[PDB]
Design a binder for this molecule. Structure first.
Ligand SMILES: [Mg+2]
Ligand SMILES: [Mg+2]
Ligand SMILES: [Mg+2]
Ligand SMILES: [Mg+2]
Lengths: 290, 408, 190, 49, 122, 204, 139, 51, 94, 87
RNA sequence: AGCGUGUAACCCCAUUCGUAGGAAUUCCCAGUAAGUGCGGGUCAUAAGCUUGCGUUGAUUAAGUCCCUGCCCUUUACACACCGCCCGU
RNA sequence: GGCCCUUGCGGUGCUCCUGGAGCGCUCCGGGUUGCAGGUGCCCGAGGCCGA
């Protein structure tokens, strides 16, 4: 299995390097196709090798997979299969950290929470890959309050690092009751840039395909690179009037790092995007919106 | 004959109660067939395109299980529902084989990561057990009572474990016993090849006191499990028109430039029908088809216990119990002789004659003794008969119903 | 060869007088070990801890009681000293004394519980042999721990006295009092 | 490195007469100056090119 | 290719053809039928066992790689392969390794200071 | 304890050789690789004979009475077997490969065709000797390998087909009017050749 | 002629022991010290299990030296036991008949399999599996 | 980082003919100096030259 | 803005029956229409010689390719279809 | 008892000697469980093969001459000096 | 013992001395609970704090819907089994 | 264990029966050999490479 995992990683990295080249080759092909369909000059760049691209156009069909995408390779089983989520904490967790980790299990459908004892980080990832765990969550705390969250996609998927700002848990609020636990509807708002689309994809694939009649809503709203997490259930008292009751934890997210590899590959994986706070114009710049 | 499967059949089995047969194929399908209506009523396939290598069914028959070449995971389906109950993961490498406990309804699966894993189906907390091995595992079988497990390993060792306690009861070394011969095209010798070959087929007897093993040889080895010795070696075939039958190839066929097997190869391939293709191990298009190598592909023993069968390259071989093979008396004495038997028959002392004829294990003497007794004295003889001889009389009666005119 | 616990206590002469508990006390030839420290995994499966030797079970159950957990060698030495003191005081095999104490300390019937906010009602029910062994070991360890607390007497002597009293059947031991009260409550609640 | 040698295996070092040490030291001093001159001239060729 | 592009027969046949070629390793990616035209006789040769041994760095020389399989030192799973003409699948490529109780495996373990007489010779 | 004996060979009904019916015609004799099986169509039964050989069976010849049979492998080893008792009576080794073996209808002689020649032997007798068959005569007609044998009903003459595109008819006894005769008229190998009910009239 | 010697490995957690067994008179040493001088002595019988199972007669013809490194006290002790047992079995296989090796190996396996086969502990928990039984979960 | 990435795809079954005559020391590949292989007759000549 | 279910090429025997009942709307009539359509789809295949010719040459190549891989390929999912069985004794199937 | 592979002595039957007189014949059963020996004195002894402990002793009417064992059936044949054969 | 290249405690053997946190409430199933030491400060967070790594290592439980709740349903004809949820 | 012109030591040169794969030879016998239709086969170099 270890040899198979290494082989699949080299296949994934090889395809990622050549992704840009195929896109440019594809783009040149469409420009030639328009020139053929509407009688016009072949572009001077496309004047040479025009016959070869014309030969390719005959060979293109719906059967082929098309141009590859590194995002699609990472989230291959996003729609077909339900995700499997595992939640763990840092070593020797606090009392309130264990309480926060208990609530995150309730939020994610099908999630499981396991005790972190003397487990090496690399050993944890090996067990998750063997048993088909899709996504792994690690949460950090400071003085009894959650402060950091790491989301890792197990099959050599991207690893995202977050910092929590304003955490309010259900356990602090008295007499709430029990949660709905239905498959939730997802609301994504405020993500307009390319990076914002990248981040929202990671958060959305943590959840399974819901039902049409589900009354459970989870909202991710972006405002000045700060992502607000909200959980709600709605009741239609009458037409056009709907009531909202807040349930579940409430906290804020701020992304600062995305790495290509898994969290066991800190010393080897490349950084897709990093936040640079010492840049001369870092104060007046945002990255999650345009 | 059923022809629904398009590609090769990897494994077959029978359900414990009904006349239902379950089959797995390289099509990616496991199909179930009934002998009452002769139809393929149920078909199981994986959500992901995978090909299956073996099949196992529960004694209850509600559970169907299969293993894969590549996805390295066990797929378990419900018989009555027809939907995929679960996928078992944790093994690394292809799965050697699967088998259900006859009495406990737990699954044992061998893998090439030197592990045999036990899976509990009807367990609320999903208990799983791991048995580590020193070498690669190839086969797993349960004793009919279900209290013992056997694993064949790549170092040619058969290890017997206790499943519930996860303790290794015993071990048997069998590399020397699996005598292997050199193929005509092999550059290496028989010993060097044998150093890398192990048993590939195991089978318990009905009583469980002996085990049968087979592989890349013309020999099937029967071992006594408790004494860990080879009781007997059977020669499946003596045909010398099959490759690798003899350890030492004939010095007569050598010339200066070797044995020149390719010329005889092409003479064999003059059969036509298809075209040989380089690198195909088996089939019509295989290069080595006219003289296939000798192999015991599978072994099985009858639940009845009077015969056993083996699938080999020659065909399907059946071996049955025969009295002529061995003389096995139970409790002999100088008084025990057929003359005294017929004497006691003449004085109408039926019980003593029948008992002393049963101390002998010649079937004709007990046949004459039982047929000499007139009706109405049957109950007296049955009451006088002790407990130990009851099983002997039942076995003789069961043998008798087949070939006796006097049924009732 | 012959296997003796700590090199001096034989296991062949040890015999069990209760038929029900023969399958749940592991002291015989297959389960004979030199030391009560094997680093095995007996909690992995249900009913597997019945295959653990009873000396190792006593060592494990004596670690949770009144100590910083994880100190197993100290508990092994405590058990060794207790066995030596038992042999000095009584003059017979300490393994037989332990087996008799576990046999005597095990309750035969308990009371299952039906409890509401106002009052609780009762019902006498039977006890499985595994729970009998577990509860006997727990009662013996608890009695030894409570005897050793706030007294000028090390835990080894209190443990030795507890096993001696329980195997004798005397009422001076904590486990016998607990067993008698539990069976009395179950008897009154039939 | 393998600097260690047994006592019986090792051989005494050569003892030089003062005459050839004067010759040998002269050549090394001349070699040091010549090597420096060529390396310095290489950078001047590298810079101008 | 000559068939109409919007034809169900062409689409199903094209997907069926490329997945077989990709499985054997003859085609780099399961892209369009353009990649299906790049297969040559040399493409089949690159999938043979001796040259795959070369890529896995088990052997450095092609005549050495052919020697190893002919002398029974390489196995694909439990089975040992002697025929150099043996196209290995991508899935089967993960499980080509030295046969146990072989001198070459002893040399590898001796270099790595992991030579165990109990496990190897047994 | 473990007393087992081979019973039957399932899974194979024909590998190579010539098919034959028994004398009464109810059962069929089929070579299955190394062994020989009798299929009783009368009683719906299959029985593999206990005998085994070193090589695959090429030729099977049946005596007219139905008691005896000759089974020859590819290597040239021959076994004389009794069908009544299902036991191999005797062993023999023909020097070269035999294309076919045929018994005369009278049952006193049989012909073995090998190489470019045909050898005529006497039928086995009641007397037991170290050598199974006594060779009587030899015929050396054709250019190339002989293929098939047929006998006249009167057992006075026999005919042999050959690879040399010609058929040779010989006499069981030296007849003044007929010692041997050759027939051509074909442009390929002879496969079979037959005789009439009560004549020397023949087909090629 | 040439010396008859075998080197074997034993492992327990991060503790690794290398054992060398050659022809000799019965000397067994660990890090230059005798077996009885290894600490802690509470598990000293744990260090003496193989010899007591096999007797001084079988160890009378070999000299064994063990070099152990890493881990804690208990892991080191278990590694030394495993190394001694495996080294003795390997020597009796290579330079003595197979029957004595078979019987000694069977005795060692029958007492405790960890004397010859090391089983490292992995992460297996209910949390990996889904709720409910394998069968009867979601129909 | 370049060195650590190369360790990921390292094949433990890799074989080289240099591996036969060289053994690792703590994981580091030290090339031991070649021997001289002197003979007793040669050894006696060196000692006479020294004196 | 949720995760959208992708399209499966595999069709199970529980959604195949669902598809037929939805469009048509007793069980035999539903099967009767599908059987007629399946035969009509089968027939059109044979009247097109180009599809016929290319289907046979594809079969030859795939048979050759499977042997070279020693029958280690990605399997094709079984298509659900309707078969016609007659009311006559079971001896004939032997 | 000697080992065939190494030639090493593996023990002996009896405290000092198996029989008073000459040993006429020895045999080992198929399962390597029981060993039977004969002596010129006329005693027939059965020995356990592994631990070499005497099981049973049978007196013979005459001195044994030759002895062979049929392992599969478990049948022992004795020829005596009085020309009789005992089974 | 095990992580950590920018000019060990714990434990162990022996010597001496000598009679702790209510009511409520939270969390936890195997290298887990608990104890002990040793490092780093890694473009966010973190200073009486944060995160790694190793050492020792347990008691009970592997099953029900009784309480407190949650997710679904009450329209692939092998054998065998089974034979209509209700109301506005 | 045995060895007594020896050796924990080493080397050579001839002989040692082809399954199909040296057939055909007791006697007898060997003399007068007494234009259907065929269209085959071969022709691809691109490296998820090692050094
Ligand atoms: Mg803790
Ligand atoms: Mg800890
Ligand atoms: Mg407290
Ligand atoms: Mg700490």
């Amino acid at each position: 299995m270890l040899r198979r995992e290494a082989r699949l990683r080299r296949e994934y990295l090889y395809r990622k390097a050549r992704e840009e080249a195929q896109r440019s080759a594809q783009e040149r092909k469409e420009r030639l196709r328009r020139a053929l369909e509407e009688n016009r000059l072949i572009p001077t760049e496309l004047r040479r090798e025009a016959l070869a691209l014309q030969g390719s156009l005959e060979f293109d069909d719906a059967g082929g997979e098309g141009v590859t995408s590194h995002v699609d390779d990472e989230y291959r089983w996003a729609g077909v299969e339900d995700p499997k989520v595992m939640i763990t904490t840092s070593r020797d967790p606090s009392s309130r950290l264990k309480m926060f980790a208990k609530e995150l299990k309730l939020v994610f459908p099908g999630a499981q929470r396991m005790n972190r004892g003397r487990h090496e980080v690399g050993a944890l990832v090996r067990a998750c890959k063997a048993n088909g765990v899709t996504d792994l969550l690690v949460v950090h705390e400071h003085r009894g309050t959650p402060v950091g969250l790491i989301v890792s996609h197990l099959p050599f998927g991207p690893t995202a690092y977050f910092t929590l700002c304003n955490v309010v848990m259900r356990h602090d609020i008295p007499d709430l009751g029990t949660m709905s636990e239905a498959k939730p509807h997802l609301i994504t708002h405020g993500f307009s840039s390319r990076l914002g689309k990248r981040v929202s994809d990671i958060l959305r694939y943590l959840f399974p395909v819901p039902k049409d009649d589900s009354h459970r809503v989870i909202t991710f709203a972006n405002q000045d690179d700060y992502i607000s997490f909200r959980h709600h259930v709605y009741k239609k008292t009458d037409h056009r009037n709907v009531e909202l009751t807040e349930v579940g934890p409430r906290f804020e997210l701020k992304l600062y790092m995305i790495r290509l590899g898994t969290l066991e590959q800190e010393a080897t994986a490349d950084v897709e995007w990093r936040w640079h706070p010492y840049t001369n114009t870092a104060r007046k710049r945002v990255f999650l919106s345009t | 004959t059923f022809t629904e499967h398009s590609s090769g059949v990897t494994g077959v089995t029978f359900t414990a109660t009904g006349y239902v047969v379950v089959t797995s194929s390289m099509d990616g399908t496991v199909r179930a067939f009934d002998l009452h209506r002769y139809r393929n009523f149920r078909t199981f396939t994986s959500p992901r395109p995978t090909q299956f290598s073996c099949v196992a069914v529960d004694a209850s028959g509600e559970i169907v299980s299969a293993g894969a070449q590549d996805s390295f995971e066990i797929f378990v389906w419900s018989m009555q529902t027809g939907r995929l109950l679960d996928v078992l993961s944790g093994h690394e490498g292809p799965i050697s084989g699967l088998c259900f406990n006859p009495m406990k309804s737990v699954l044992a699966s061998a893998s090439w990561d030197k592990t045999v894993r036990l899976w509990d189906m009807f367990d609320s907390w999903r208990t799983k057990e791991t048995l580590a091995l020193t070498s690669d595992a190839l086969a797993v079988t349960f004793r009919p009572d279900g209290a013992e497990l056997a694993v064949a390993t790549l170092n040619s060792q058969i290890t017997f474990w206790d499943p519930e306690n996860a303790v290794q009861t015993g071990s048997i070394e069998g590399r020397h016993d699996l005598k292997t011969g050199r193929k005509e095209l092999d550059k290496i010798t028989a010993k060097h090849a044998a150093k890398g070959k192990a048993f590939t087929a195991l089978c318990y007897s009905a009583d469980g006191h002996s085990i049968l093993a087979g592989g890349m040889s013309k020999f099937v080895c029967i071992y006594h499990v408790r004494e860990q010795i080879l009781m007997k070696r059977f020669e499946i075939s003596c045909n010398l028109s099959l490759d690798a039958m003899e350890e030492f190839l004939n010095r007569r066929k050598m010339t200066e430039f070797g044995n020149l097997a390719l010329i005889d190869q092409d003479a064999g391939q003059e059969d036509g029908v298809a075209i040989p293709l380089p690198g195909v191990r088996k089939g019509d298009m295989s290069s080595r088809h006219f003289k296939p190598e000798i192999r015991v592909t599978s072994l099985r023993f009858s639940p009845t216990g009077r015969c056993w069968a083996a699938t080999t390259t020659e065909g399907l071989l059946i071996y049955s119990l025969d009295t002529r093979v061995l003389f096995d008396p139970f409790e002999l004495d100088t008084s025990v002789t057929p003359g005294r038997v017929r004497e006691a028959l003449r004085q109408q002392d039926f019980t003593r004659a029948i008992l002393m004829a049963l101390r002998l294990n010649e079937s004709k003497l007990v046949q004459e003794a039982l047929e000499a007794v007139p009706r109405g004295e049957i109950e007296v003889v049955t009451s006088s008969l002790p407990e130990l001889y009851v099983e002997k009389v039942l076995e003789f009666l069961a043998s008798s119903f087949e070939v006796s005119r006097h049924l009732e | 060869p012959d296997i003796k616990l700590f090199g001096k206590w034989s296991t062949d002469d040890v015999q069990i007088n209760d038929i029900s508990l023969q399958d749940y006390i592991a002291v015989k030839e297959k389960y004979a070990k030199y030391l009560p420290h094997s680093a095995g995994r007996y909690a992995a499966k249900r009913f597997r801890k019945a295959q653990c030797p009873i000396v190792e079970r006593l060592t494990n159950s004596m670690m949770m009681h009144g100590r910083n957990n994880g100190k197993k060698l100290m508990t092994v030495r405590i058990v060794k000293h207790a066995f030596e003191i038992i042999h000095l005081l009584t003059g017979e095999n300490p393994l037989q004394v332990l087996v008799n104490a576990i046999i005597n300390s095990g309750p035969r019937e308990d009371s299952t519980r039906i409890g509401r906010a106002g009052t609780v009602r009762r019902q006498a029910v039977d006890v499985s042999p595994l729970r009998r062994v577990n509860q006997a070991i727990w009662l013996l360890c608890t009695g030894a721990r409570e005897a050793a607390f706030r007294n000028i007497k090390t835990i080894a002597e209190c443990l030795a006295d507890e096993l001696i009293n329980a195997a004798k059947g005397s009422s001076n031991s904590y486990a016998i009092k607990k067993k008698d009260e539990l069976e009395r409550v179950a008897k009154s609640n039939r | 490195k393998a600097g260690k040698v047994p006592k019986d295996r090792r051989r005494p070092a050569v003892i030089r007469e003062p005459h050839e040490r004067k010759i040998l030291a002269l050549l090394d001093a001349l070699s040091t100056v010549h090597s420096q001159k060529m390396k310095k001239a290489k950078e001047q060729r590298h810079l101008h090119n | 290719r000559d068939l109409p592009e919007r034809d169900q027969f062409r689409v199903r046949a094209s997907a069926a053809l490329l997945d077989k070629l990709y499985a054997l390793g003859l085609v780099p990616t399961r892209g369009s039928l353009e990649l299906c035209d790049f297969v040559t006789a040399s493409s089949f040769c690159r999938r043979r066992l001796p040259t795959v041994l070369l890529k896995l760095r088990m052997a450095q020389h092609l005549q050495a790689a052919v020697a190893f399989v002919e002398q029974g030192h390489v196995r694909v799973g439990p089975d040992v392969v002697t025929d150099p003409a043996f196209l290995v699948t991508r899935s089967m490529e993960d499980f080509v390794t030295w046969v146990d109780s072989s001198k070459i495996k002893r040399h590898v373990l001796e270099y790595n200071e992991e030579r165990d007489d109990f496990d190897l010779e047994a | 304890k473990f007393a087992y004996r081979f019973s039957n060979l399932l899974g194979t009904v024909y590998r190579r050789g010539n098919l034959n019916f028994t004398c009464d015609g109810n059962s069929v004799i089929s070579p299955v690789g190394n062994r020989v099986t009798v299929f009783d169509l009368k009683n719906n039964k299959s029985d593999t004979l206990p005998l085994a050989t070193r090589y695959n069976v090429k030729c099977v010849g049946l005596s007219p009475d139905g008691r005896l049979a000759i089974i020859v492998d590819e290597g040239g080893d021959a076994l004389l077997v009794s069908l009544v008792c299902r036991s191999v009576l005797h062993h023999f080794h023909f020097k070269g490969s035999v294309h076919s073996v045929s018994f005369s209808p009278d049952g006193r002689k049989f012909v073995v065709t090998k190489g470019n020649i045909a050898q005529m032997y006497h039928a086995p007798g009641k007397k037991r000797e170290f050598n199974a068959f006594v060779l009587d005569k030899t015929y050396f007609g054709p250019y190339d390998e002989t293929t098939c044998i047929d006998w006249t009903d009167d057992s006075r003459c026999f005919v042999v087909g050959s690879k040399d595109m010609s058929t040779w008819v010989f006499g069981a006894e030296r007849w003044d009017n007929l010692i041997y005769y050759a027939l051509g008229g074909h442009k390929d190998a002879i496969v079979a050749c037959f005789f009439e009910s009560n004549s020397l009239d023949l087909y090629s | 002629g040439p010396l008859q010697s075998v080197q074997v490995f034993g492992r327990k957690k991060t503790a690794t022991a290398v054992a060398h067994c050659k022809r000799g008179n019965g000397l067994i040493k660990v890090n230059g010290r005798p077996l009885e001088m290894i600490e802690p002595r509470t598990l000293q019988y744990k260090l003496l299990e193989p010899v007591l199972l096999l007797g001084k007669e079988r160890f009378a013809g070999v000299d064994i030296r063990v070099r152990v490194k890493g881990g804690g006290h208990v892991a080191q002790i278990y590694a030394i036991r495993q190394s001694i047992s495996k080294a003795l079995v390997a020597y009796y296989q290579k330079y003595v008949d197979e029957a004595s090796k078979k019987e000694i190996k069977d005795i060692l396996i029958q007492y405790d399999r960890t004397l010859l086969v090391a089983d490292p502990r992995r992460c297996e928990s209910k949390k990996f599996g889904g709720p409910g039984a394998r069968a009867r979960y979601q129909k | 980082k370049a060195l650590r990435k190369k360790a990921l795809e390292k094949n433990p079954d890799e074989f080289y003919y240099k591996m036969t005559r060289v053994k690792l020391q703590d994981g580091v590949h030290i090339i031991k100096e070649t021997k001289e292989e002197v003979t007793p007759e040669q050894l006696k000549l060196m000692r006479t030259q020294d004196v | 803005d949720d995760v959208v279910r992708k399209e499966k090429p595999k069709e199970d025997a529980y959604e195949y029956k669902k598809r037929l009942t939805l469009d048509h709307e007793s069980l035999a009539e539903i099967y009767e229409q599908e059987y007629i359509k399946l035969n009509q789809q089968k027939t059109a295949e044979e009247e097109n010689p180009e599809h016929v010719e290319i289907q046979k040459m594809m079969d030859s190549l795939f048979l050759k390719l499977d042997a070279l891989s020693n029958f280690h390929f990605i399997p094709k999912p079984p298509v659900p279809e309707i078969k016609v069985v007659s009311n006559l004794p079971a001896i004939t199937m032997e | 008892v000697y080992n065939m592979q190494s030639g090493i002595h593996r023990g002996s039957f009896g405290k000092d000697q198996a029989h008073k007189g000459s040993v006429r014949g020895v045999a080992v059963d198929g399962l390597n469980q029981l060993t039977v020996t004969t002596g010129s004195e006329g005693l027939l002894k059965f020995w356990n093969f592994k631990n070499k402990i005497l099981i049973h002793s049978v007196s013979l009417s005459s001195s044994p001459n030759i002895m062979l064992l049929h392992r599969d059936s478990g049948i022992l044949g004795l020829a005596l000096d009085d020309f009789s054969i005992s089974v």
